[PDB]
Design a protein around this ligand. Structure first.
Ligand SMILES: CCCCCCC/C=C\CCCCCC(=O)OC[C@@H](O)CO
Ligand SMILES: CCCCCCC/C=C\CCCCCC(=O)OC[C@@H](O)CO
Ligand SMILES: CCCCCCC/C=C\CCCCCC(=O)OC[C@H](O)CO
Ligand SMILES: CCCCCCC/C=C\CCCCCC(=O)OC[C@H](O)CO
Ligand SMILES: CCCCCCC/C=C\CCCCCC(=O)OC[C@H](O)CO
Ligand SMILES: CCCCCCC/C=C\CCCCCC(=O)OC[C@H](O)CO
Ligand SMILES: CCCCCCC/C=C\CCCCCC(=O)OC[C@H](O)CO
Ligand SMILES: CCCCCCC/C=C\CCCCCC(=O)OC[C@H](O)CO
Ligand SMILES: CCCCCCC/C=C\CCCCCC(=O)OC[C@H](O)CO
Ligand code: NA
Lengths: 87, 95, 111
C-alpha cells in the first residue's frame, strides 16, 4: 500500500509538468493515504470496544471505507484531468 | 454508506458542484481544485459520521469526551466547508 | 436550516476546547492563520493561492479529526488504543509535511 505512493511520485517526477500540476498529482495521492490512516484508526477504536458485532460498529467502518473510496475517486479524477491536459 | 438519510442533502450538494465544475470553461488545474475541494467536504463528513457512530456505539451515558469528540468532528467539517467556499470564490471570482 | 445551526454550535465548541486545552494547538492555529493571510497578500495566480491556503487548512482538518479520535480513545479509558493514536498521528504528520513541501515548492517558483 506504500509502494503505490512512491510509484506515483516517480511518475509525477518522470512526467514533465509544472510545479502546480506536480503538487496536485502528489497531494491527491497523499490525501488517500491520510484518509486510509484515519479510517484504520477508527477501525482500531471499533475493535478496541470489542469483537461482538454491533449495528453502530459496522456503520462506523462503512462510513470510514466510503471516505477512502471518495478520496480514491478524487485521485483518479485528478490524474485523469491533469494528464489529459498535459498531453 | 447509508445514502438513505441526511447524507442525501450533503451528497447532492457535493454531486451538483462536481457536475457544475465538470461543465465550466476553466483550465484543468482550476477544474481539479473545484472538484476536490467539495470532494473533501464529503470525505470529512463521512469521517465525522464514523466517529459519531463509534461514540454512540460506546453507549447513551453522556461523557465530556464524547461530546468533545463529536464537537471536534464537526469543527473539521466546518473547516472543510470554509476551504471549499474560499476555493470556489478565489477561482471563480474572475468569471 | 436548524441542523446547520446546531452543527455550527458543536463546531465552535470544538474549536474552543481545542484552543483552550493546548498551547500546541493554539500555536498551530497561529501558524495556519499567518499562512492564510500571507497567501492572501502574495502576488501569485489564483490557483497557487488556493494551494497555499488549502494545504495548511487540510492540516487543521486532520488535526481536528485526529483529536476527535484521541477523545474517543480516552473516553473508553489498549494495544489498539495505542495503535489508533499512532495511525491518527501519522496522518497529522503527513498533512503537515505536505503543507511545508507545498509551500516550499510553490514559493521557490514565485520567488
Ligand atoms: C435553479 C437554478 C440552479 C442553478 C444552479 C447553478 C448554476 C451555475 C452555473 C450555470 C452555468 C453552467 C456553466 C456554463 C458554461 O460555463 O459553459 C461552459 C462553456 O464551455 C460554454 O461553451
Ligand atoms: C511550523 C512553521 C510555521 C511557520 C508559519 C509562519 C511562516 C509561514 C510562511 C513563511 C514564508 C512566507 C514569508 C515570505 C513572504 O512573506 O513574502 C512576502 C512577499 O509579498 C514579498 O514580496
Ligand atoms: C498514466 C498512469 C498513471 C498511474 C498512476 C495513477 C494513480 C491514480 C490514482 C491512485 C490513487 C490511489 C492510491 C493507491 C491506493 O491506495 O488505491 C489502491 C486501490 O486498491 C485501487 O486504486
Ligand atoms: C466515472 C465514469 C465517467 C468517466 C469520467 C471520469 C473522468 C474524470 C473526470 C471527468 C470530470 C471532468 C470532465 C470535464 C473535462 O473536460 O475533463 C477534461 C479536462 O478539462 C482537461 O483535462
Ligand atoms: C473569508 C472566508 C469566508 C467563507 C466562509 C463561508 C462559510 C459558510 C458556511 C459555513 C458552514 C456553516 C456551518 C456548517 C457546519 O457547521 O458544518 C457541519 C458540522 O460541522 C458537521 O456536520
Ligand atoms: C462563487 C463561489 C462561492 C460559492 C461556493 C459554492 C459552493 C462551494 C462549496 C460548497 C460545498 C459544501 C456542500 C456540502 C454541504 O453544504 O453540507 C452541509 C451540511 O449541512 C453539513 O453537515
Ligand atoms: C459567493 C460569496 C462567497 C462568500 C465568501 C467570500 C469570502 C471568501 C473569498 C473572497 C474572494 C476575494 C476575491 C478573490 C479573488 O479575487 O481571486 C483572484 C485571484 O486571487 C487572482 O490572483
Ligand atoms: C479562514 C481561516 C480559518 C483557519 C482556521 C482557524 C484556525 C483554527 C482554530 C483557531 C480559531 C478558533 C478560535 C479559537 C477559540 O475558540 O478561542 C476561544 C477563546 O480563546 C477562549 O475563551
Ligand atoms: C484574522 C485572520 C483572518 C484570516 C483571513 C481569512 C481570509 C481567507 C481568504 C481570503 C480570500 C483571499 C483573497 C485573495 C485576493 O485578495 O485576491 C486578489 C487578487 O490579487 C485579485 O486579482
Ligand atoms: Na484542504
Amino acid at each position: 500500500e506504500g509502494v503505490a505512493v512512491l510509484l506515483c511520485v516517480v511518475i509525477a517526477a518522470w512526467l514533465d509538468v509544472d510545479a502546480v500540476t506536480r503538487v496536485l498529482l502528489i497531494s491527491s495521492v497523499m490525501l488517500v493515504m491520510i484518509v486510509e490512516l484515519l479510517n484504520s484508526a477508527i477501525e482500531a477504536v471499533v475493535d478496541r470496544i470489542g469483537s461482538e458485532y454491533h449495528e453502530l460498529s459496522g456503520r462506523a467502518k462503512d462510513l470510514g471505507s466510503a471516505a477512502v473510496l471518495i478520496a480514491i475517486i478524487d485521485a483518479v479524477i485528478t490524474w485523469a484531468i491533469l494528464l489529459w491536459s498535459h498531453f
